[PDB]
């Protein structure tokens, strides 16, 4: 096991990196990286591929149609493209996308990906949070997946071991790219922010992969901190700091 506790700065969490070359895992906090939790918006990595496979979307410019609803997040108040919806974690766009796919198609795809518990039984999500249609099975609801399962899922998608078309995977790779101010490495990923009301802990995520000098690492950074200030964006900062200190050479 490895120790990346310095990059977490006292925040409760864990990290797992996987190299498909030597089939080796670098694990910080084994018990946490094996614990299933709601994926929150990291599910957009998979819902993007589902939409492309089913023809609901077709490109990084694809739009779903904006009904004018004024959302708290003003970055959601427009007919945004796939790329924008992914980068802004736009829930209304992805809920409208998944509502165009029958549950049987989603179930078969998650079962074939071995996506954690593959439980989409609470389709509409946890409505007792009063957010109405801004809910879904992937947002603090029935679907749960461990950080290790996220990395195993990322590896199968990007190494070409799934049924998804390489054309759709290339679209996903493009919208996942993030700027880390280091052209020697390529970082891709998706943030996730949720609060587990039952256990009173955050589900803060950053899931993706790193490409550096012929080597590829699939990773999942996760926080279960008590402090609601700990969000996906904060875990993304921790991930970049882990990458800079332990994966630069």
Residue numbers in the entry: 40 to 288
Please give the exact wording used by the authors of the publication that reports this structure:
Clostridioides difficile causes life-threatening gastrointestinal infections. Herein, we report 30 X-ray structures from a structure genomics pipeline spanning 13 years, representing 10.2% of the X-ray structures for this important pathogen. The Center for Structural Biology of Infectious Diseases (CSBID, formerly the Center for Structural Genomics of Infectious Diseases) implemented a structural biology pipeline starting in 2010 through paired efforts with systems biology, bioinformatics, and other research specialists in C. difficile pathogenesis. This project ultimately involved 335 proteins linked with pathogenesis, metabolism, and antimicrobial resistance.
The structures presented here are part of the C. difficile 630, R20291, and Y384 sets nominated at CSBID. The overall success of structure determination for C. difficile in both CSBID pipelines was 7%, with a total of 23 unique structures and eight variants or ligand-bound proteins determined.
